[PDB]
From a paper:
The phosphoinositide 3-kinase (PI3K)/AKT axis is pivotal in the development of cancer, with oncogenic genetic alterations in PI3Kα occurring in approximately 14% of cancers. These mutations are found throughout the PIK3CA gene but are highly enriched at hotspot amino acid sites in the helical (E542K, E545K) and kinase (H1047R/L) domains, though the frequency of PI3Kα hotspot mutations varies across cancers. To test this hypothesis, we developed STX-478, a second-generation, allosteric, mutant-selective PI3Kα inhibitor that interacts with a previously undescribed allosteric pocket within PI3Kα. X-ray cocrystals were generated to identify the binding site of STX-478 on PI3Kα.
Compared with published PI3Kα structures, the cocrystal structure of H1047R with STX-478 revealed that the compound occupies a cryptic allosteric site that forms due to a major conformational shift in residues 936–940, along with other smaller, local rearrangements. Specifically, residues F937 and L938 occupy positions that would directly clash with STX-478. Rearrangement of side- and main-chain atoms of these residues resulted in the repositioning of F937 and L938 to create space for the allosteric site. The benzofuran and trifluoromethyl moieties position at the deepest point of the pocket, anchoring against hydrophobic and aromatic residues. The urea present in STX-478 forms a bifurcated hydrogen bond with the L911 backbone carbonyl and a suboptimal hydrogen bond with the G912 carbonyl. This hydrogen bonding secures the inhibitor's central linker with the pyrimidine positioned closer to the protein's surface. The K941 side chain forms van der Waals contacts across the pyrimidine ring in an orientation roughly 180 degrees from the typical WT conformation of this side chain. The K941 side-chain nitrogen is positioned within hydrogen-bonding distance of the D1018 backbone carbonyl, stabilizing the protein in this conformation. STX-478 was found to be a potent and selective inhibitor of all kinase-domain mutant PI3Kα forms found in cancer, including the most common variant H1047R (IC50 = 9.4 nmol/L), with 14-fold selectivity over WT PI3Kα (IC50 = 131 nmol/L). STX-478 binding kinetics revealed a faster association rate with the H1047R mutant and a slightly faster association rate with the E545K mutant, suggesting that these mutations open the allosteric site more readily, enabling the mutant selectivity of STX-478.
Residue numbers in the entry:
A (entry chain A): 2 to 309, 322 to 410, 416 to 502, 521 to 1063
B (entry chain B): 327 to 413, 424 to 435, 441 to 586
Write the structure that this text describes.
Amino acid sequence: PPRPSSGELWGIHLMPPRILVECLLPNGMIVTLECLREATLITIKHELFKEARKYPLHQLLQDESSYIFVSVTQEAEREEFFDETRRLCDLRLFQPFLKVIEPVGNREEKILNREIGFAIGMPVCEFDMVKDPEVQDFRRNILNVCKEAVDLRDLNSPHSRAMYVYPPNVESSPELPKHIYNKLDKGQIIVVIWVIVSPNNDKQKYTLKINHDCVPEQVIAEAIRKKTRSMLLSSEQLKLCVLEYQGKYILKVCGCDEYFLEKYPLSQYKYIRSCIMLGRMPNLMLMAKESLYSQLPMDCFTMPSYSRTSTKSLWVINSALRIKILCATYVNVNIRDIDKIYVRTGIYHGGEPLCDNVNTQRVPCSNPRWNEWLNYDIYIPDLPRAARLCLSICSVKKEEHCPLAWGNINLFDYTDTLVSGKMALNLWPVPHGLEDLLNPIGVTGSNPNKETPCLELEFDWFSSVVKFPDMSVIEEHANWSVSRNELRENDKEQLKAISTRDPLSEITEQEKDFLWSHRHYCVTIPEILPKLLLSVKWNSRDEVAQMYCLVKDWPPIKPEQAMELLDCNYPDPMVRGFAVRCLEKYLTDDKLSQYLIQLVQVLKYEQYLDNLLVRFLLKKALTNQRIGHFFFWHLKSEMHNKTVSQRFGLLLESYCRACGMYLKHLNRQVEAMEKLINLTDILKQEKKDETQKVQMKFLVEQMRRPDFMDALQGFLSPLNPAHQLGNLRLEECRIMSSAKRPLWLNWENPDIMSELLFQNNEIIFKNGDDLRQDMLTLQIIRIMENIWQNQGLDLRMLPYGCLSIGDCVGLIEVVRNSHTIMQIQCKGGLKGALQFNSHTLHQWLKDKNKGEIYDAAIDLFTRSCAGYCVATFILGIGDRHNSNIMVKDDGQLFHIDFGHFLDHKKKKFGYKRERVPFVLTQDFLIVISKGAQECTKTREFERFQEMCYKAYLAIRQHANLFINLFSMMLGSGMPELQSFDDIAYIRKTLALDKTEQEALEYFMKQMNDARHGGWTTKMDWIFHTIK
Amino acid sequence: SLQDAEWYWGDISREEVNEKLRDTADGTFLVRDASTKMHGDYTLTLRKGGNNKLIKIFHRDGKYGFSDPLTFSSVVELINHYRNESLLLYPVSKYQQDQNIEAVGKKLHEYNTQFQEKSREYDRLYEEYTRTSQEIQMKRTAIEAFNETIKIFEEQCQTQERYSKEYIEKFKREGNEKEIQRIMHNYDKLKSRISEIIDSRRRLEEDLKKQAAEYREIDKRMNSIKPDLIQLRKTRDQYLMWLTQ
Ligand SMILES: C[C@H](Nc1ccc2c(c1)OCCn1cc(N3C(=O)OC[C@H]3C(F)F)nc1-2)C(N)=O
Ligand SMILES: Cc1c([C@@H](NC(=O)Nc2cnc(N)nc2)C(F)(F)F)oc2c(F)cc(F)cc12
């Protein structure tokens, strides 16, 4: 199984400098050899064979090369160490010992299976021992997607391979909003093309003024025209020279591995649009196509070793559903206090029950035996395809009921077969805080931990193997059900109002029947499909069959709208397939990367391992390495979770089998992260009581060791694979003064023109805190900026990078030239004041932007401040303070640390719910009003309020998208987002049960109250105490 | 007479309606305001077959109802009419909360103090429960690793017994006792090492056996105090509801 600790030996974080390794020779002898913890297996084998000649049977020892080492790893696996360049510490041994053996089997196949297993977290042989035919059918059948994805990469190669490795980092639309177009000099952009001339890197620049919408090949054409401008070529000769060589070069971003390889307008590339808004000069580097294509290796996709009766329709069986509960093996309960136990059962279609729940008779705790046939209030033909049995063993103790162990089963298996015969089910433990007697939202399947309460079951048999009907049968039955509407002016107006309602709105039973009765008129307004589907009686064969036909011929919808149909509320395979079809045809690679967090989460709701969503996401992962990179990390980050280890493990294995050479790069990142996890685990556990100076001494000593220097240098940044992390600047590395003591790392940018982007790349590694909440908040902030910017509202956010890479382990991107509001306050004078001067922030910003650039900095502060005020209000980010708000030297205000704003939402013991009030400090209004004393009434404040009103309504217009993005996250193990009630607060702030004008007035009321609430209270800044 | 009715619950959220409808799974019901903008229009939540269904009470021309025939003069008349049609079953009463102002307040502090002391014990039991569960899974894999380690050393014994077999025959014939005792010194070193490994594995098997029993007893203590913790939460919440009235 996956390793429980990143230690170099079992229960030992670090090996001592020298260690005694028991070497088991091939002649039969046993030699204890002293080795350095950083010694390579090449050195250890050479030293072992020198000492082996001293011991007996030395005549039977062949050459060192003829043998290979073997040992038990901490994953309880017999690993054959093919790569002999590996260090003893990096081998992950269970105990210090190595057997020398004659190598066997296909060496090249075994090397790849080690590399796949290392990146996954678990060994590949674990999947071979799984006897579930669905698990082996997934492994075999999913390779059809992998082979199709690899065939696309070698369709128009080497350009197809180059596009896979370096996808064009572009925005979804080439239309530049008016505020972005107005920043161009008469629609034109001034760019700088660089070329390397001499081997010692003698550079040459070419400043060009070109139209913003020039495709990269037209940029190359203008560079060719400038270089061949004084070569006596006629207007015809030059035109034919330009047209011949424009396709022989490609542009690259100076400082990083981002290439302009596709025919998109230059401005559609995110780097160029960023340069336009920031007013920066784009620095691109020109190079020959063969210079990049020679660097790309053609890694072939070898097929693995694992790649090699009557049936009655469900609707024929006219009978009531019956399930017999035989007995449970045991139950962790005390015979005193608890009187009896029973098995509560229910048939569900997602969270909604299809019928009244049915319990077994109560039996004594010591003898869990029922042998009772339970009859459910639904007939077998009326079972929808996603019908599931949800059960649990409960206790009794007015009368109180409590769940003890829960479990769910798919009533139809992956081959459409209805469950039949006897079957055992190892039950799962009750989650913390779940008081519900059943867990329908919980994982569907038997607990892999077989040392758990096992409940035997029995499903009825019907002479033949019962299978769910074909689409041909369902289509014919739907036409029969219609043979066994009206409309009015109010009906069309009511349908349009219901489609615009947010997903969380309350749909009444009259509205449900109204939508179902006018279901054929609904096709004219396709955005109402989610509301109509909730109105379908899913426990009715006739309504479901008719819905299937409407879904079959339903027109497509926006991907943002189709995403809702993948959350917990829509479990039907026909609805989910419809949603995937919309994403296949309409979701761009920009939006797929944008919403990949949720799309990976909704994979957990799928009933079966092989399905249309996973086949879609794995295809985009294997045909776009930017999508593939985060697809790997979002799945790898949850491999510790035994609930999803097998699902995500099988998926990651299929990804790694065909991702190509990128598996080598991901292993480098995994190695580097394993070392940082182990290093920080020592500081977090044994060396926790030691001083900051003492911990830093240890940190330097360990980071300098060769094993650490090799592992932590020359690898791609997991936060952005376009950034390479070269040599580590050890003098710049430090333990930060923050929660969980995160580690600040610094690397040189090994790019040839690093100087034109960033010389050093800094990342904060944090071990202890759950970063999913920060990741999701930062994603929402990026999506809000994206809405505002697309609408033409220039509000600048800073959604810095954040990536969770394990169980409460992650990376945070460092923003260069930024400081907290308290760091600004302390940097600028102070003199022990207790009350910080409110004008200090304005003065600091004035000094950083003197002269002409002053007005620009104030505008950027106003635009960034306005949107963070709106974002923090809509999301209820009330935990804001002078140490978790930062301002860049250029004036950009942005917020950091979003893991703690929901800690005090709970309300228990009459705390009024702690409503998040809208607030804006006087310090910021002084910056916005350019140092005015009466800052609450200036023309700059007037514009600022107007910025917030427009931005607030722009988010309220797309309220359904934010509700859908959070609704998809409910299935994730995040304790902050479990039920739709945790999202309900966004409806209070966005005022969704009001008109747009009423919501604008509501927001204006909360913003005008914030002026009164921004009280300059006479209290010290350290402890906050009033006289 | 809607304020006098027990089933009318002012302006409660959707979360509190579904919370107050879980064990009551038959035909339990309650009424509340549909929205602040409507005000005069209310909503009726009924249980049905598991899912809590919501039915709106429309209000136009003074008369109330669900469909076109508004044959009801008041909201109270509308609900009382459908109770007689059933003979809807149980109303969620805000007034009915069976146990002076001084006694209700002092005993509420006693139930809150007792609930927080038992909540603290559940946090201690859960922290040790998860710690024990994590340690059990580690010991379970450490046994799998020891089993594979023992299998490797057993294969090494069969390798030594096979290769040394022909050399021992040569040295016995040649009378070279030094080389027989040198090969036996290494064999009895390999065999004693296996004993040390099997002792370590069996030592950990008993730690796992005892930690599994500890885990089962932590889970028994949690499952015995979980019902006590829920009835104390419902008791203290009723004492606070009556204290406000
Ligand atoms: C020199 C240093 N620069 C800096 C520091 C922290 C962050 C940052 C830049 O970039 C913004 C992203 N960021 C995010 C966080 N943190 C966060 O998300 O939670 C707590 C805190 C911790 F990780 F350090 N810290 C930073 C400074 N001003 O002291
Ligand atoms: C859950 C959740 C939310 C909701 N916000 C609040 O509940 N704010 C609030 C209200 N009252 C108090 N006392 N404290 C906080 C909401 F934004 F969705 F509405 O936002 C989240 C977010 F951005 C990221 C995330 F990972 C989870 C969530």
